[PDB]
Design a protein around this ligand. Structure first.
Ligand SMILES: Cc1c(N2C[C@@H]3CCCN[C@@H]3C2)c(F)cc2c(=O)c(C(=O)O)cn(C3CC3)c12
Ligand SMILES: Cc1c(N2C[C@@H]3CCCN[C@@H]3C2)c(F)cc2c(=O)c(C(=O)O)cn(C3CC3)c12
Ligand SMILES: [Mg+2]
Ligand SMILES: [Mg+2]
Ligand SMILES: [Mg+2]
Ligand SMILES: [Mg+2]
Lengths: 247, 487, 487, 245
DNA sequence: ACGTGCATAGTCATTCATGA
DNA sequence: TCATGAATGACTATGCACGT
């Protein structure tokens, strides 16, 4: 199985890869034009393609199907993945065996993730079941040591850890430039994105798994559905314990 | 590669979104009635010195300062938020003094960032009054480089005054604006009757706050919806514009609309009537002409046919257009980091509590500072009494460290105080200058006693809020705009 | 209503536009090689403290500061100008240190203002070096609120180094960038041979400035065009990229392009080749693949057919693509408010003249300040010599003025000096501090002697420019990038 | 009489008066200024057509390309008259065409581009004195107690300042004299009381004396021949100040 | 279906001179 | 016709909850 990549019938925003093998190909679904631009530059153009998404994705749970199919961003995703939707879904025509969702570490990136995951679960569920969907974890900090190579941190804890270790090791940091804190993918350059989210030898990916389909169906409908009351009560009920889901 | 279940991811991510939107974006803090973007814009302008005592700064500078230090978001929407706070038809009491084209109540958009200038209004200066005296908790900004205020002093009830509208997740708020003088009376009562229960307090406050006071004037019809909002936190308030029937030389009649209800777009309103007359659902209307201008204000002339009754057409307009429209009140605000629907007495009380907190904290700040000044002054006075020895000591010292260590031993003084003696100028050794130090000590000790007295007396604390608020209202309070009528 | 003839209106209005564009927009000042927007952006960042000794500020803050104080134009285009000055493929020696996505040599646009941060580069700090020491004339800004510099100190030849391109009215400029080390040698010669005529100077400078040095590396073919540019002020310099033929194991041969000439868009270049294969105008080419990355840089692989000669295809590429392209040099710059096409010797000389002016003005400023401090120090020493008397006098004074007036009488002192004595802290009455005052007087008088010597000797002045520039080049100078070859 | 929109440009904020003889079209530089003008105008007799960006040079550009330009189409359509040989002054929808641009050089440039469009496509509009130029204010004097005054030149500013101080009036040294750098910085009220109020506005009527001489000047300044324009500027820019002495 | 307000920018067309 | 580089921003689409 092999499929042609665009080079001078696919989305205009798509920066496709060169490899014609889906098994080896990857699609990075990116939040924002800036981040997508940097990703297009820092990627490995052989196996990695970039599809920047602009603005909040349409909620396929709330909006009727005809309106969803008219949405330019949804069309781009469906077209880029190559597979159909719902009953016309054919995994054989999947153009990328790795679909990496890359959003900002901030709160709005989390929201876009849920909107994208909702699109996938409702229109192209088998992509989730067969583990073709991943979540890229962007860096939060960049430690710029005076003499040593810079280190990236993906949490406040890791920042504190790498800071302590380096200082203990006799390294030093400026208290001015110091630790750069990322507030979004758009603030990163090509190199930074490669060395934290796209280089397969250092990137931190999370594979989206689907255990209970019925339970998932209910949760999607509650959180993303038209019923506000259900969503309100669910949030007030479970937000109190969001910290303790993995304890 | 780590595995993660879709349910865990969805739940965690969406809750994180909902909560921050609820608490940190779409909904107002009950104490100052501000959303984060509002608070950050105002403080940015404040810290930048963009105040009414200086000329308008380019609004781009306010946006950029807000972006770079406090609000990690886009310049575009931040400008929109700044612009809104400058529109007299949006805010009942504008917090931004805009210079240039800030749009109109119609479809005329505001000018771009490059064209406009902006500074804080005098009332916005009361929002930030004495913010630098530890009157409110500060926290580090989004990257820890600088501090930002968690809440503003808000020396007038801004939430109730300017209202607030916001769409969050799972909930939304829609608080109407109110007349400052009426709110003040409510606060004055709350201060006097500080022990009154909620039942009594609600009755009193509802008597003084007659209802919302919209910047667009207009009319409020009925009293139930207003009462519902204040008692329940939800109510439907019927609004109306103002219509004045005019007769012509020929003897033709025309309806002149000079006011519209809150948040009704003038252009959309005219267009709606125009579209409702072609298809033909508002017969009796002969012609629609917008005779509005910057000099006469809103003036929509509706010429009606000879075989048409004025009130019939007006009633049809009330029915089929936003000439009559309801304000869906929902008194939702963030209280102690939690979203809560509040009664009117709760809104007043929580604000009064905030004011008392501000005044006590200000007093504490001033008291601490007064003691520090007094402490150093006491040191200087000791030096003056033994000035001959002090100077001789400093001179005979090989360094300033030898001189300092000696001064402590000489006069039995702290290191901070001894430091002050060293920092003393030869100016302060003049006769009259020596005297001012003495008197200043006497002056401050009186101030310290006063400040201590305030902290010890809840009566004075309440009195200060009353007197200071009264001063603000006398200066910045205005007449009611929205007229309240019965059914 | 006043009548006006169309010819009068057209002539006046268009000339007014042309002149301001010529002198105050599109063309560079010869002394610092900067256009108004460049100069204003850099000074705005400088005054704001956006320097290499501090973390990158949000670029929005630089734009807003430039817009609000110096550059009365749009935020959009100002950001574009700032961004460009940060791109290593645009400026041979970038003046802005950018943090974030500033685009690529291809069609990848820069990130929006909200995403990027920016500060001045170390070399840009040399552009502004000692600007606060009256080294350049300042004028009121566009509204008279603040002062702005007419020209920067420019402690390295920025015009020739970074070049300049601009479209004005009736004329346009296109100065290529050059290697800083080569320019320095030219300046060093100009300083040593300060009396040399234009003929000798042109010969000397042309020998040291071997040709343009583009940030995009590549090749310069031939020497005629370069010579023309330096001798005439106009010349066509033939540029080429770098091509390396690779042979696959028993496979077809392919051309690897790793460099392109100045200002050639990578994406447009690839597209041009691709489209010229379609209708078929570059036969012999089998496949085009962009193997470029952030880690290997530019790498365009052009596999050619087996029945095709590599050298033939490369010449076809030279012919029908910008793999070979000419730089149309037109050495136009503003000299004393007048647009002028300059020889290379004139460009160097005018720059050297500017440097000498800066150093002389700096020296004069420092001499004036040195005298003022010395003047005050002389007062302090008089006070120390009669310290016992100084104190007793101040004590008996009803005011500080009586104390002051006495000091004048006691020690024969100015009003400034007596005031300085008055402002003196008890800190400085310690032994080592009294000695420090003495030594400080001795130091300044020594510095004054040095400064006076500089002003009296043009030799030293030239020496200062040489030594200071040399220090800059040693630190910030780099290797040549563009290779110069013969026909 | 002609119908007003309530088949014309979308950007056009037409007037209410159906009489062209009484109607006026303010051709404005920028959306901001046009927006403020639309509000401060007298909607009865004054219509607003905001123009965005530099107008296309009809002297340089090919005819077909000019007709594709949205801004040119807006002008031609709004004026109602045809162009060139199909010009019919009878269908002129506004007998007063006021060009209102910023006082800055780019405003001057836009004026020349518009005057070029008019002179080449719709010359009779100039010949019959239907074309005017609005002179925007440069300064606004904000007296502490008295009504604010507007100035249209540096000299007038100095004069009004001098007169006021002599009369015992006073100004803030902070707020003080506001300097306008463009129409976009003005609000509706300010524009009315300086450029649109017919009882105080300073308009200049464009007159056409020698058509042949004008034709040559337009071709020199606006044409494709750069050398001619270059030499003309270097020749005459030296004496631009002394054209009215 | 529309308004609300704080969140998630690229595209579009000219002046102007010059050389392909 | 195109690139060049400083000059002269509106329009376009979603989330989110609620009431006509
Ligand atoms: C109007 C404008 C543009 N439009 C003008 C044209 C005629 C009207 C229909 N729209 C097209 C496109 C444009 F394409 C780009 C910019 C800018 O890039 C820009 C900028 O600041 O960079 C500023 N403006 C506006 C002030 C004029 C721009
Ligand atoms: C993307 C975006 C918008 N759209 C353009 C694109 C059209 C095709 C795909 N959908 C998007 C959505 C938009 F209409 C407004 C804004 C803004 O007003 C705005 C703002 O800052 O106010 C910012 N953005 C971008 C960051 C996402 C906006
Ligand atoms: Mg983000
Ligand atoms: Mg927007
Ligand atoms: Mg632009
Ligand atoms: Mg302008």
């Amino acid at each position: 199985n092999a499929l042609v990549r665009r080079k001078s019938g696919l989305p205009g925003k798509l920066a496709d890869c060169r490899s014609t093998d889906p098994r080896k190909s990857e699609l990075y679904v990116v939040e924002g034009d800036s981040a997508g631009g940097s990703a297009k530059s820092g990627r490995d153009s052989m196996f990695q393609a970039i599809l920047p998404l602009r603005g909040k994705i349409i909620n396929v749970e709330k909006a009727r199907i005809d309106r969803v199919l008219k949405n330019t961003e949804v069309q781009a995703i469906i077209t880029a993945l190559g597979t159909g939707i719902h009953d016309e879904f054919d995994i054989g025509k999947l153009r990328y065996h790795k679909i990496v969702l890359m959003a900002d570490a901030d709160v709005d990136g989390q929201h876009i993730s849920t909107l994208l995951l909702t699109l996938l679960f409702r229109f192209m569920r088998p992509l989730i079941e067969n583990g073709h969907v991943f979540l890229a974890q962007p860096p939060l900090y960049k430690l710029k040591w005076q003499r040593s190579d810079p280190e990236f941190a993906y949490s406040d804890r890791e920042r504190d850890g790498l800071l302590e270790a380096g200082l203990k090791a006799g390294k030093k940091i400026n208290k001015e430039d110091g630790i750069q804190r990322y507030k979004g993918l758009g603030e990163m350059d090509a190199k930074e994105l490669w060395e934290t989210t796209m280089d397969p030898s250092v990137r931190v990916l999370r594979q989206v798994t689907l255990d209970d389909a019925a339970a998932a169906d209910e949760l999607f409908s509650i959180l993303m559905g038209e019923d506000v009351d259900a969503r309100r009560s669910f949030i007030t009920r479970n937000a109190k314990d969001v910290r303790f889901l993995d304890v | 590669i780590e595995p993660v279940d879709i349910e865990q991811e969805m739940q965690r991510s969406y809750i994180d979104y909902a909560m921050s939107v609820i608490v940190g974006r779409a909904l107002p803090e009950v104490r100052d009635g501000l959303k984060p973007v509002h608070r950050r814009v105002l403080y940015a302008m404040f810290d930048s010195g963009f105040r009414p005592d200086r000329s308008h700064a380019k609004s781009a500078r306010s946006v950029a300062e807000t972006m770079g230090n406090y609000h990690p978001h886009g310049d575009s929407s931040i400008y929109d938020s700044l612009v809104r706070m400058a529109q007299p038809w949006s805010l009942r009491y504008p917090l931004v003094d805009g210079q240039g084209n800030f749009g109109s109540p119609g479809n005329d958009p505001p000018a771009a960032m490059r064209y406009t200038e902006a500074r804080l209004t005098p009332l916005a200066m009361e929002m930030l009054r004495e913010i630098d005296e530890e009157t409110v908790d500060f926290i580090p900004n989004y990257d820890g480089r600088v501090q930002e205020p968690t809440v503003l002093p808000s020396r007038f009830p801004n939430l109730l005054a300017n209202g607030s509208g916001g769409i969050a997740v799972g909930m939304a708020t829609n608080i109407p604006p109110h007349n400052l003088r009426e709110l003040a009376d409510a606060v004055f009562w709350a201060l006097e009757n500080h022990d009154a229960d909620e039942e009594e307090t609600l009755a009193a406050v509802m008597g003084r706050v007659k209802g919302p006071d919209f910047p667009t004037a207009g009319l409020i019809v009925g009293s139930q919806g207003t009462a519902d909002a204040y008692k329940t936190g939800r109510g439907s308030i019927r609004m109306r514009g103002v219509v004045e029937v005019e007769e012509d030389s020929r003897g033709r009649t025309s309806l002149v609309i000079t006011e519209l209800p809150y948040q009704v777009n003038h252009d959309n309103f005219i267009t709606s009537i125009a579209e409702q007359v072609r298809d033909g659902k508002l017969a009796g209307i002969s012609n629609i002409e917008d005779q509005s201008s910057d000099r006469v204000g809103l003036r929509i002339v509706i010429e009606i046919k000879r075989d048409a009754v004025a009130k019939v057409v007006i009633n049809n307009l009330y029915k089929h257009t936003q000439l009559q429209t309801s304000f869906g009140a929902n008194m939702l605000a963030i209280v102690d980091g939690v979203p809560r629907t509040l009664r009117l007495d709760q809104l007043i009380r929580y604000y009064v509590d905030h004011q008392l907190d501000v005044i006590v904290r200000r007093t504490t700040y001033r008291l601490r500072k007064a003691n520090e000044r007094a402490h150093i002054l006491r040191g200087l006075v000791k030096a003056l009494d033994a000035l001959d020895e002090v100077i001789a000591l400093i001179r005979a010292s090989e360094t300033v460290d030898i001189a300092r260590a000696g001064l402590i031993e000489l006069l039995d003084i702290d290191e901070i105080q001894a430091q002050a003696i060293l920092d003393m100028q030869l100016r302060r050794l003049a006769a009259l200058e020596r005297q001012r130090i003495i008197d200043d000590l006497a002056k401050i000790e009186a101030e310290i006693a006063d400040l201590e007295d305030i902290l010890a007396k809840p009566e004075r604390q309440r009195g200060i809020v009353r007197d200071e608020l009264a001063e603000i209202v006398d200066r910045h309070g205005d007449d009611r705009r929205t007229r309240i009528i019965a059914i």
